[PDB]
Amino acid sequence: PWELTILHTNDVHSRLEQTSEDSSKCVDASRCMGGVARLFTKVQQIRRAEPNVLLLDAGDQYQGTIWFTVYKGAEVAHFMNALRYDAMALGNHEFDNGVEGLIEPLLKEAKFPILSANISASGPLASQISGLYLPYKVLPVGDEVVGIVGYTSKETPFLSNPGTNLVFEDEITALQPEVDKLKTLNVNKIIALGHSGFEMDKLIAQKVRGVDVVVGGHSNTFLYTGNPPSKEVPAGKYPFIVTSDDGRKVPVVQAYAFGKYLGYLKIEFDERGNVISSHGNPILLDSSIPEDPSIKADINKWRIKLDDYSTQELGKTIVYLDGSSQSCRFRECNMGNLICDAMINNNLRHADEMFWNHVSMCILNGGGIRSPIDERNDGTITWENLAAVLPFGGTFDLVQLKGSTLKKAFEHSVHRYGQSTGEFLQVGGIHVVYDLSRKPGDRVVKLDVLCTSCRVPSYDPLKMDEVYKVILPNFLANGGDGFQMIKDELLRHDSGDQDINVVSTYISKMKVIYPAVEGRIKFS
Amino acid sequence: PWELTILHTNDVHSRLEQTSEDSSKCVDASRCMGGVARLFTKVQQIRRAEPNVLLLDAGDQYQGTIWFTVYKGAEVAHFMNALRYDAMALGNHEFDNGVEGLIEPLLKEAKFPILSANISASGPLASQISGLYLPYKVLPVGDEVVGIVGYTSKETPFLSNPGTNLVFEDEITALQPEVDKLKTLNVNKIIALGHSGFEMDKLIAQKVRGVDVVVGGHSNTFLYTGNPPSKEVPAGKYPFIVTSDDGRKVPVVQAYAFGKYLGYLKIEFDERGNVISSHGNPILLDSSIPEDPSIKADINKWRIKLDDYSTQELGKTIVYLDGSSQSCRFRECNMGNLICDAMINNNLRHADEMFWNHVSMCILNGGGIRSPIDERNDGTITWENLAAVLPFGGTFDLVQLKGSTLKKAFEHSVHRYGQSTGEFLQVGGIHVVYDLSRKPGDRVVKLDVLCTSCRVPSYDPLKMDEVYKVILPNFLANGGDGFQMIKDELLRHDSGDQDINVVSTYISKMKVIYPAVEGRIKFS
Ligand SMILES: O=c1[nH]cc(I)c(=O)[nH]1
Ligand SMILES: O=c1[nH]cc(I)c(=O)[nH]1
Ligand SMILES: [Ca+2]
Ligand SMILES: [Ca+2]
Ligand SMILES: [Zn+2]
Ligand SMILES: [Zn+2]
Ligand SMILES: [Zn+2]
Ligand SMILES: [Zn+2]
């Protein structure tokens, strides 16, 4: 039997440095986790012990910290080249800076193949990008070869900025003929590596004949066999076994997000490329694994430009930005309005004739707003100022919620009003009126929402059965601040851009801001 | 006696081409007026007949048409140099593109002295601008000399973009020592040429000892002795005689605006520089005066880049811009919101610790909105599209109105609601609620306004005795669409930027717009 060791990452999201246990800023270094210097140590150790190793990334290196803001993907090519990745699939966030922001910094600089079989280009872009990403690559491993076939979320146009000159095809439709072609080329060991989420990964494993292993991402899925080593709760066993339509057992793997774990799957193959066995588990990259000193020293050199950038003027405010708890946990605050307006601006995507924009609505818990910004420093706003407002290292995510769920969220917002608690909601594209004289659970007396399926945006009453797209913090999508109804009732969730980055981009674009308190939230 | 002919313009405001009788676009060429080619003809004729002639401009050549938008003052230097102006005073609109937009195109290119005695600079700007404008110039005229002393509105920081490195001094305080110094230099014939408005011009004539003549501007004042030749109604005789504190008769002149008239004042002086007599009248530049063919051919050559610019993309909309009368004469319309938001953005000026911005409020009659803009031309917006929305060649002006006046304006807005009439108001920084079941004059049931004297902008009830700054069309400041209360009751009026230009600048800055209907105007 021929044994392959698959090492894999996904949704690293700009965690070049070690992090806290929750993937935010490292404060207590003796208990920090992840980062590329520690990954380097572990990969190097495994490559010293195992003959046949592939190191794969399932996409979404782009977006997540000030690293991406400043280096715009150059850090991804540099550090992925230093760890000698064997292949990467394109994720949705690889399109955040458009096609141009993918071609240059990443496709032209990577020393490893970058894969997606379900993205096509037309017009002059097709010539410009031809061969810079591939449907698949056949890689030599010891005396054998392994085919790696890529895929990227069909939903990327709604979740990033790929532009109007790329088409994202159905993953299974695109994959099958490529896997069929590899079999004609005498390649009998096939890995599907891609970025569509665990549910699609299971469909690919079931339906794409000839796929031996699926290595996925996007959904930040944690799989584990046994007692988990940290706080993440497994969604299933590692690997997750799918019974294929042709009667084979096909392992499906993912490795959470943020570089906290290295996925590790051992596969035994027979002479004909059938999987005989698969076993493994993600490895927690905790402080017991030393950071490689060389990579750490390069990280520290690259940090200098981040420190410099952190104190530069992004733009100006002519108004006090009221992020005080005394305001934002009690009533509409202009900091809340600013952040929600930034959130909606970040989620402007290509719009057909059926909507002005696919999403119009935002909620933001007041507990997530942690500082004001004074306008009397010549109006300057810096990244450091925004990091005091938004200190948790979160994202502003896209969800789909029934109107009944959103009404329950607004009732929760004021259920125990008057105690300075974090659940009070700041809003965009929503007008709410509360009557605090009513019983908890029955305090929302008006709730109007901005249309999407309209040429002129205007407000209509919320409909209990309609499904709304809403931008909100990952903290709320995960049921933080008692929003268990959002976690339990949402119909779709996709992780978005870094919180600070969303607001910094908006401020830079606007140049001078003056957010008002304008009646989005009233009391009767 | 030594006789001087003073020819003078003021507030030409980018009317390089001949205009209609109302100073808008020329449609019926056989009845058009003004423009620099016709001015050239008349000036040349007078200089052939009169030995001692000065041609003076009292400021505000900048701002008013697409000429200024595209050529940014290069057209002003070029055509003022071609007509051989003898001197110009700085107007408020000469600062619309900042100090940098005055130094280059105008101060470095003019072949005539540019004057203001009451503007000082500090820091590095003082070195950069030293001598590029002067307090005064002594000009030879025949065998004599004439001193010309300039001044510029002390209110310029509120009415343009001069920046924080210029100080505008009290005009009379600054002028007196300069006029005193000219007398020590044996200059006994002194013209005060400046840009503060007719009321200040009369104060200068009264109080600045040694001023023989005041040639003013800013207030677009029309003076005439006799039956007027066109539609403008005189504010007084030409010249307007002020009795000075030292007992002299001091003539004060102005010549309306828009290049429609050439001011013409004949002064007789004695040997000691005392005015013996003054008489004259502005000359209507109507179609009986031919356009100079050479200047007209140069105007037509410069027009090519304007035509090209007119069809260029300024920015994008992802929403239908509803400028239909069926919307904007009946309810809040998103075109109205866009234009008022552009108006407030245009009037962001330097703000001390006492206000976030000096003005927060906007009204716009629906009758002034003359077209929608469709978003389905790939979202493109062009100048030509904006000219269909705003076709009248107006300005967005700054006024001061008591709250009682503004309440009367909102009652007028709906006094005869339901007939598709032009007075229905679109708004910014104002939230109004109407009850149409009430008697005309008593339909406004809520009227809240955005604060200025606040660090966080928020809405408060309108106060009847408080004076508000409001941005509104010149058409309304002049009592158009039945707003006689605005004309009759306003406390201050200053003309603003060209309507199209205000909206085009905002669209270019924003890049992608998506104005909503959001509840600024409600019905109960
Ligand atoms: O909004 C929040 N995000 C994360 C934490 I931890 C919290 O208290 N609040
Ligand atoms: O708003 C307007 N400006 C100018 C005219 I003439 C008119 O009808 N309406
Ligand atoms: Ca196989
Ligand atoms: Ca004199
Ligand atoms: Zn991701
Ligand atoms: Zn993803
Ligand atoms: Zn003017
Ligand atoms: Zn002026």
PDB file of C-alpha atoms in Angstrom, chain B residues 350-464:
ATOM      1  CA  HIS B 350     -13.846  75.302   8.317  1.00  0.00           C
ATOM      2  CA  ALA B 351     -15.551  74.740  11.633  1.00  0.00           C
ATOM      3  CA  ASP B 352     -14.243  75.940  15.026  1.00  0.00           C
ATOM      4  CA  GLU B 353     -15.109  74.273  18.352  1.00  0.00           C
ATOM      5  CA  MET B 354     -18.633  75.924  18.248  1.00  0.00           C
ATOM      6  CA  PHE B 355     -20.176  73.886  15.360  1.00  0.00           C
ATOM      7  CA  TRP B 356     -19.550  70.687  13.393  1.00  0.00           C
ATOM      8  CA  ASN B 357     -20.455  72.754  10.310  1.00  0.00           C
ATOM      9  CA  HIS B 358     -21.920  76.242  10.010  1.00  0.00           C
ATOM     10  CA  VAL B 359     -24.941  74.976   7.995  1.00  0.00           C
ATOM     11  CA  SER B 360     -26.929  71.685   8.198  1.00  0.00           C
ATOM     12  CA  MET B 361     -30.184  72.392   6.318  1.00  0.00           C
ATOM     13  CA  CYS B 362     -31.429  72.389   2.717  1.00  0.00           C
ATOM     14  CA  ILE B 363     -34.684  72.979   0.872  1.00  0.00           C
ATOM     15  CA  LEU B 364     -35.300  72.465  -2.818  1.00  0.00           C
ATOM     16  CA  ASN B 365     -38.582  73.072  -4.654  1.00  0.00           C
ATOM     17  CA  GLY B 366     -39.802  70.033  -6.635  1.00  0.00           C
ATOM     18  CA  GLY B 367     -40.493  72.377  -9.563  1.00  0.00           C
ATOM     19  CA  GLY B 368     -36.729  72.856  -9.860  1.00  0.00           C
ATOM     20  CA  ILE B 369     -36.189  69.096 -10.548  1.00  0.00           C
ATOM     21  CA  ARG B 370     -36.886  68.591 -14.244  1.00  0.00           C
ATOM     22  CA  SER B 371     -35.823  64.982 -15.124  1.00  0.00           C
ATOM     23  CA  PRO B 372     -35.068  61.590 -13.671  1.00  0.00           C
ATOM     24  CA  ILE B 373     -31.822  59.723 -14.477  1.00  0.00           C
ATOM     25  CA  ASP B 374     -32.057  56.060 -15.453  1.00  0.00           C
ATOM     26  CA  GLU B 375     -29.439  53.710 -13.868  1.00  0.00           C
ATOM     27  CA  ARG B 376     -29.592  51.157 -16.717  1.00  0.00           C
ATOM     28  CA  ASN B 377     -26.842  52.976 -18.898  1.00  0.00           C
ATOM     29  CA  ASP B 378     -24.266  50.842 -16.940  1.00  0.00           C
ATOM     30  CA  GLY B 379     -24.995  53.217 -14.008  1.00  0.00           C
ATOM     31  CA  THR B 380     -23.262  56.126 -15.823  1.00  0.00           C
ATOM     32  CA  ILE B 381     -24.145  59.733 -14.901  1.00  0.00           C
ATOM     33  CA  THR B 382     -22.880  62.538 -17.187  1.00  0.00           C
ATOM     34  CA  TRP B 383     -22.981  66.323 -16.951  1.00  0.00           C
ATOM     35  CA  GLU B 384     -25.542  66.271 -19.837  1.00  0.00           C
ATOM     36  CA  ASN B 385     -27.776  64.039 -17.671  1.00  0.00           C
ATOM     37  CA  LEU B 386     -27.472  66.492 -14.723  1.00  0.00           C
ATOM     38  CA  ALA B 387     -28.237  69.465 -17.058  1.00  0.00           C
ATOM     39  CA  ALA B 388     -31.641  67.801 -17.880  1.00  0.00           C
ATOM     40  CA  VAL B 389     -32.363  67.590 -14.117  1.00  0.00           C
ATOM     41  CA  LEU B 390     -31.191  71.183 -13.407  1.00  0.00           C
ATOM     42  CA  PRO B 391     -31.688  73.167 -16.648  1.00  0.00           C
ATOM     43  CA  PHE B 392     -32.148  76.775 -15.387  1.00  0.00           C
ATOM     44  CA  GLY B 393     -28.496  77.829 -14.762  1.00  0.00           C
ATOM     45  CA  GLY B 394     -29.136  78.667 -11.095  1.00  0.00           C
ATOM     46  CA  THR B 395     -27.065  78.560  -7.923  1.00  0.00           C
ATOM     47  CA  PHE B 396     -27.460  76.923  -4.519  1.00  0.00           C
ATOM     48  CA  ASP B 397     -27.308  79.896  -2.149  1.00  0.00           C
ATOM     49  CA  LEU B 398     -26.816  80.426   1.584  1.00  0.00           C
ATOM     50  CA  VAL B 399     -29.557  82.338   3.484  1.00  0.00           C
ATOM     51  CA  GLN B 400     -30.428  83.062   7.087  1.00  0.00           C
ATOM     52  CA  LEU B 401     -34.169  82.552   7.925  1.00  0.00           C
ATOM     53  CA  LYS B 402     -36.032  82.760  11.219  1.00  0.00           C
ATOM     54  CA  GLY B 403     -37.763  79.533  12.170  1.00  0.00           C
ATOM     55  CA  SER B 404     -41.151  81.361  11.751  1.00  0.00           C
ATOM     56  CA  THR B 405     -40.202  82.074   8.076  1.00  0.00           C
ATOM     57  CA  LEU B 406     -39.186  78.446   7.436  1.00  0.00           C
ATOM     58  CA  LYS B 407     -42.511  77.220   9.028  1.00  0.00           C
ATOM     59  CA  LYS B 408     -44.353  79.586   6.639  1.00  0.00           C
ATOM     60  CA  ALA B 409     -42.309  78.102   3.739  1.00  0.00           C
ATOM     61  CA  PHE B 410     -43.327  74.522   4.724  1.00  0.00           C
ATOM     62  CA  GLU B 411     -46.998  75.618   4.976  1.00  0.00           C
ATOM     63  CA  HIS B 412     -46.689  77.168   1.479  1.00  0.00           C
ATOM     64  CA  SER B 413     -45.139  73.816   0.294  1.00  0.00           C
ATOM     65  CA  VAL B 414     -48.526  72.082   0.795  1.00  0.00           C
ATOM     66  CA  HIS B 415     -51.093  74.984   0.804  1.00  0.00           C
ATOM     67  CA  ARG B 416     -52.736  73.701  -2.434  1.00  0.00           C
ATOM     68  CA  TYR B 417     -51.386  70.125  -2.298  1.00  0.00           C
ATOM     69  CA  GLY B 418     -52.553  67.668  -5.018  1.00  0.00           C
ATOM     70  CA  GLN B 419     -52.212  69.862  -8.193  1.00  0.00           C
ATOM     71  CA  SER B 420     -48.610  68.928  -9.144  1.00  0.00           C
ATOM     72  CA  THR B 421     -47.352  72.459  -8.390  1.00  0.00           C
ATOM     73  CA  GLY B 422     -43.696  73.392  -8.070  1.00  0.00           C
ATOM     74  CA  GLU B 423     -43.526  74.673  -4.467  1.00  0.00           C
ATOM     75  CA  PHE B 424     -43.517  71.203  -2.763  1.00  0.00           C
ATOM     76  CA  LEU B 425     -40.164  71.054  -0.882  1.00  0.00           C
ATOM     77  CA  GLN B 426     -37.506  68.360  -0.957  1.00  0.00           C
ATOM     78  CA  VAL B 427     -35.206  68.581   2.062  1.00  0.00           C
ATOM     79  CA  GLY B 428     -31.919  67.785   3.790  1.00  0.00           C
ATOM     80  CA  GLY B 429     -31.220  68.173   7.546  1.00  0.00           C
ATOM     81  CA  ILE B 430     -34.998  68.694   8.047  1.00  0.00           C
ATOM     82  CA  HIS B 431     -37.714  66.181   8.988  1.00  0.00           C
ATOM     83  CA  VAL B 432     -41.248  67.380   8.329  1.00  0.00           C
ATOM     84  CA  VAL B 433     -44.659  65.773   8.951  1.00  0.00           C
ATOM     85  CA  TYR B 434     -47.793  67.124   7.262  1.00  0.00           C
ATOM     86  CA  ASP B 435     -51.464  66.510   8.089  1.00  0.00           C
ATOM     87  CA  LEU B 436     -53.327  67.353   4.840  1.00  0.00           C
ATOM     88  CA  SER B 437     -56.717  67.034   6.690  1.00  0.00           C
ATOM     89  CA  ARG B 438     -55.854  70.400   8.411  1.00  0.00           C
ATOM     90  CA  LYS B 439     -56.647  73.894   6.975  1.00  0.00           C
ATOM     91  CA  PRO B 440     -54.067  75.358   4.549  1.00  0.00           C
ATOM     92  CA  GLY B 441     -51.538  77.279   6.698  1.00  0.00           C
ATOM     93  CA  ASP B 442     -51.881  74.788   9.580  1.00  0.00           C
ATOM     94  CA  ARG B 443     -50.772  71.474   7.897  1.00  0.00           C
ATOM     95  CA  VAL B 444     -47.240  71.249   9.392  1.00  0.00           C
ATOM     96  CA  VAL B 445     -47.548  69.064  12.512  1.00  0.00           C
ATOM     97  CA  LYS B 446     -43.865  68.308  13.136  1.00  0.00           C
ATOM     98  CA  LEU B 447     -40.748  70.138  11.945  1.00  0.00           C
ATOM     99  CA  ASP B 448     -37.373  69.031  13.267  1.00  0.00           C
ATOM    100  CA  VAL B 449     -33.990  70.367  12.137  1.00  0.00           C
ATOM    101  CA  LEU B 450     -30.390  69.123  12.345  1.00  0.00           C
ATOM    102  CA  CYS B 451     -28.297  71.045  14.904  1.00  0.00           C
ATOM    103  CA  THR B 452     -25.136  72.920  13.933  1.00  0.00           C
ATOM    104  CA  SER B 453     -23.919  74.045  17.389  1.00  0.00           C
ATOM    105  CA  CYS B 454     -23.347  70.467  18.524  1.00  0.00           C
ATOM    106  CA  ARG B 455     -20.541  67.869  18.308  1.00  0.00           C
ATOM    107  CA  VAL B 456     -22.977  65.042  17.420  1.00  0.00           C
ATOM    108  CA  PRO B 457     -25.533  66.106  14.770  1.00  0.00           C
ATOM    109  CA  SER B 458     -29.084  65.335  15.905  1.00  0.00           C
ATOM    110  CA  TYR B 459     -32.603  66.634  15.273  1.00  0.00           C
ATOM    111  CA  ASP B 460     -34.486  69.077  17.502  1.00  0.00           C
ATOM    112  CA  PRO B 461     -37.802  70.873  17.052  1.00  0.00           C
ATOM    113  CA  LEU B 462     -37.610  74.038  14.995  1.00  0.00           C
ATOM    114  CA  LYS B 463     -37.727  77.233  17.177  1.00  0.00           C
ATOM    115  CA  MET B 464     -39.765  80.111  15.749  1.00  0.00           C
TER     116      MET B 464
END
